[PDB]
Structures are given as structure tokens and as C-alpha cells.
Symmetry: D2
Subunit: 80 residues, 4 copies
């Protein structure tokens, strides 16, 4: 009778509860993934930038050891 109305009414309030749970959860995940993602990008971007700078630097150095080892040979000629 009026029994069944108050039931359907309590169910609705709960079957809704559990659906909002599912949505918040999905939203939580989107946030987790999106945060974790951006981070991993920054880290990886940094490493790469780092290694490029080391390439830039280990190169200027090699340049010099040649540039020099060569001006030695020049001298070795112009002299003895």
C-alpha cells in the first residue's frame, strides 16, 4: 500500500547514492591520470633537456681538445 511507496522512495535515494559514487570515482581517476600524466611529461622533458645540454657541453670540450692538439702540430711545424 503506502508501504511500497516509502520503499521505492528509500531505494531511489540509495540507488542514486551508489551512482554518484561511480561518477565521482571516474572523475577522481581522470584527475589522478591527468596529474600523473603531466608530471611524467615534465620529468621526461627534463631528462631530455639535461642530456641535450650535456651533449652541447661534452661537444664544446671535444672541439677544444682537437683545436688545441692541432695548434700543437702547427707549432711543431713552425719550429723544430
Amino acid at each position: 500500500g503506502v508501504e511500497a511507496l516509502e520503499d521505492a522512495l528509500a531505494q531511489i535515494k540509495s540507488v542514486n547514492n551508489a551512482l554518484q559514487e561511480r561518477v565521482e570515482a571516474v572523475a577522481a581517476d581522470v584527475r589522478t591520470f591527468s596529474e600523473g600524466y603531466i608530471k611524467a611529461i615534465e620529468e621526461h622533458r627534463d631528462k631530455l633537456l639535461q642530456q641535450l645540454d650535456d651533449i652541447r657541453i661534452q661537444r664544446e670540450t671535444a672541439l677544444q681538445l682537437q683545436k688545441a692538439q692541432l695548434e700543437q702540430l702547427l707549432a711543431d711545424m713552425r719550429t723544430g
Copy 2:
């Protein structure tokens, strides 16, 4: 043998400017990707968080409306 070496020098010198530029370019793109990428990740996170919101809003309103409806019977059945 002198002029020879004067040359090896000039060669070493200008092979360097070139490889310098290139590395600087890789680094540039390494930058550009990450801002673009992090932009997109953000944009999309938002668009998804938004529709997830709309699902909630839409379902809540239908709850409120439906509750209101069955609340009315609830009174009109308490006597009515």
C-alpha cells in the same frame, strides 16, 4: 703541412656551429612538445570533468523532481 692544418682548424670550427644549432633545435622542439602536450592533457581533463559534472547535475535534478513527485503522493496517501 702548415696550411693543411690551418684548414683542419677552420673545418673543425664550422662543423661545430652547425651541430650546435641542430642540438639547439632538438631542444626547442623538446620544449614545444611538452607545452602543447600538457596543454592538451589539461584541456581534455577539463572537458571530461565537465561532462561528468553534467551527468551528475542532470541526474540530481531528475532525482529532486521525482522525489518531489512521490513525496506528494506520500502526503495525499497519508489521508487524501
Copy 3:
């Protein structure tokens, strides 16, 4: 004299080894990152695609439970 020419020649031949290793490493990493990413994207795209499917399902069922609970009432009326 000729001593110092084969040194500079073993230098360049070695200093290149080191620069290749460096560039190799970089590209190695670009590889793992992109691979690592694409995985993560697939995994999250899947988990999401999955939770949303659960949301339709868990919704269809809430619907039917309501509909059915309502028709019960509508009948409780038409009869006793």
C-alpha cells in the same frame, strides 16, 4: 711529430665514440618514454571506457528496478 698526429687521430676516433654513445642514449630514452606513454594512455583509456560501461549498466538496472517498483504501486491501486 708524427707521434702527435696519430694521438689526435686516436682522440677524434674515441671522442666520437663518446658522442655517439651520448646521442644513442638520448634516442634510447625517447624510445622508452614514447612506449611507456602509449601504454599508460591505452591502460587509462581502457579503465575509463570500462567504468563508463559499468555506469550505463548500473543505470539500466536502477531504471528497471524503479519502473518495476512503480508498476507494483500502479497495480496495488487498480486492485486492492
Copy 4:
């Protein structure tokens, strides 16, 4: 009070199509984003992998050219 419940029924029916669509569309986006993300990661890896490669070529050939140049002196000094 039948009509009331005949009404709830119809409301439930119509709320549900709407919430179906919205969840569909959410999922449609989850699909498209991963296609973009994945696609353009891959473009990038390729772009960078290419340039790293060119750094290699540009250096490799400069080495070849320099090697050849100093190989010659080596001969023209191993006699005169």
C-alpha cells in the same frame, strides 16, 4: 492516482535516454582523445628521432672528412 504513476513512469523513461546519450558521448571523447594523444606522441618521437639521427649523420661525415684529411698528412709525413 494511477495517472500520477503513469506519469512517473514516462519521466523515468525520458530521463534515461538523456543520461544514456551523455555517457555515450563522454565515452566517444575518451576514444578521440587517446587517438589524438597517441597519434601526436608518435609524430613527436618520429620528429625527434629524425633530428637525433641527423646530428649523427652530420657528425659522422665530418669525422670521415677530417679522418681523410689527417690520414693524408700521415702518409706525406711517413715520407715527405
